[PDB]
Amino acid sequence: NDTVVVGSINFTEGIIVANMVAEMIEAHTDLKVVRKLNLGGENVNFEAIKRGGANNGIDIYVEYTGHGLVDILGFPEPNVYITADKQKNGIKANFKIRHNMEDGSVQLADHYQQNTPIGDGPVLLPDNHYLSTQSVLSKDPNEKRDHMVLLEFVTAAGITLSMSKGEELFTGVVPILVELDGGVNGHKFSVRGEGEGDATNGKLTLKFICTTGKLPVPWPTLVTTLVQCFSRYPDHMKQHDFFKSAMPEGYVQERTISFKDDGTYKTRAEVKFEGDTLVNRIELKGIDFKEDGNILGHKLEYNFPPPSSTDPEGAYETVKKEYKRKWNIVWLKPLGFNNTYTLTVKDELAKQYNLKTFSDLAKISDKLILGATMFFLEGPDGYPGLQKLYNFKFKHTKSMDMGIRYTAIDNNEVQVIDAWATDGLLVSHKLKILEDDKAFFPPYYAAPIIRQDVLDKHPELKDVLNKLANQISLEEMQKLNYKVDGEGQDPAKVAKEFLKEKGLILQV
């Protein structure tokens, strides 16, 4: 008759699902369940489970795959979106790097990038596309200087299915020399990197050494600054490779890297051929940095995010793998619903304009008004990035909180609203969810997760909580959330009755 702590945030769905977990544990084990309400941040349950029931924490809670992937692990290494900068005869790029910290924090680094050809020869000005990079950081146990070994795989994509003279310089393996002279808050340092790039495979192998003693910043903060000419452009996208077309004269790459709540890097680099060697010479100035912050205090983990989702189940397997390795938290089987953020329209408008996807809406955005939450319109991963990816051009966008957007779309003041996919008010307001076809919002698959040691003390918990696998669909979770948010039913009572009518608990 041991006790385990199940945690829940003060949100309808969270309370319902934690009550379900609790009732399953108590119905199939001799264990007592302590239901702990956690109030606060988005990872309040994550810190509660890292603490554990032994120290006023929790042992089990229902986590979401996308939340863990994005805000705790900083998964996928961003797809770097590249656009033509016609005024500069070059390209622009913006992206976010998410540096991991040991405690589950994420240091954001917003990257703004300008590339301009060095010579006056013609270059490829690309259609909008992206470069996907997978970076692996490692160490040479025989190297006593501050150093980083970097292995990178870059592939171009974003365009559905002969070459410049500069790409002819990339048919084989090209030696790479990288020189960085940097100053961060007055701390001067130099980095020299030697290696080789192979653009036909998109592979980069480099060894960077701080030649001036200890590096005052963490090595991953410099990975993006310390050779996109070595990206692998598939045969149908080679006309969009600005970087190779600018060779051998090369290009100037300038970047502003804004570390959220910390200083900024401003980098200017010349990327060019010298002899056979592709040389990247960089000047870096870092300013406004807290000397005890994540960057100057060396609080970032020595890694880059693990590789992307080639398998549509590899997202969940990635959170499982990383949570077990870093904090010994076991991800159990998913509950079965994807509580992703979404745009919804009244179903009759969707039927009138044959709307099923976000891009169908983006083709008609200029006619429609968007009434959304501040959470959506102002989130660093909300409406800005969604608009840039879909080129949303809504007639107006109105900030509507405190129930205003629901009544607004009901009264046709607004035609599109943001919502959680399991919002209980969606069906009662005859609203249709549209599919994020470009996958801007991460899938949010709910799955119980448990400390590994708690599972060692009571190994029966895995099966008892996996009895809920694929047992709650999006529609079922919607109906229960409506049972709590439309009618005033008790979340514990709604949960217990759902589990009873599905036969998941033995009572009665």
Residues 6 or more apart in contact with residue 443 via CB below 8 angstroms = 65, 66, 315, 338, 340
* 363 close to 391: Cβ distance less than 8 angstroms: no
DSSP state of 127: P
Question: Residue 15: how many CB atoms within 10 A of its CB?
Answer: 20
Report CA Rg, the chain.
Answer: 25
Residues 6+ apart with CB under 8 A from 269: 225, 252, 253, 254, 255, 280, 281, 282, 283
Question: Residue 422: which domain range?
Answer: 338-434
Residue entry with tokens 């169908």: 360
Neighbours of 61 (CB within 10 A): 26
In angstroms, what CA-CA distances link 125 with 58, 117, 372?
54, 11, 36
Buried b / exposed e along 190-215 (16+ C-beta atoms within 10 A): ebbbebbbbbeebbbebbbbbebeeb
> CA-CA distance, 446 to 337, in Å (whole number)?
7
Q: Are 3 and 53 in contact (CB under 8 A)?
A: yes
- Helix 12-28 to helix 491-501 angle, to the nearest 10 degrees? 50
**Other CB atoms within 10 A of residue 89 CB:** 17
- 170 SS3 class: helix
CB 182 within 8 A of CB 193: no
Documented resolution in Å: 2.5
| CA torsion, ordered 268, 273, 276, 282, to nearest 10 deg | -10
The β-bridge partners of 417 are 344, 371
Residue 219 phi/psi, 5-degree rounding, is -55, -45
Amino acid at 314: G
Amino acid identity, residue 81? Y
Q: Say which CATH number the domain at 414 has.
A: 3.40.190.120
Torsion of CA 118, 120, 124, 126, to 10 degrees: 60
Is the separation of the CB atoms in 248 and 172 below 8 Å? no
C-alpha–C-alpha distance, residues 396 and 405, integer Å:
13
Count Cα atoms within 13 angstroms, Cβ side, for 177: 9
Residue 393 near residue 441, CB atoms below 8 Å: no
Question: Rounded to whole angstroms, how far apart are CA atoms 161 and 109?
Answer: 33
Of residues 64, 12, 62, 30, the one with CA closest to residue 492: 12
CA 61 to CA 69: how far, in whole Å? Answer: 16
The sign of the dihedral angle between the CA atoms of 380, 381, 387, 389 is positive
Amino acid letter, 259: F
Return all residues near 231 (Cβ < 8 A) that are at least 6 apart.
Answer: 131, 154, 155, 156, 199, 202, 241, 243
d(CA 265, CA 287): 7
The rounded distance, in Å, linking the Cα atoms of 256 and 218 is 17
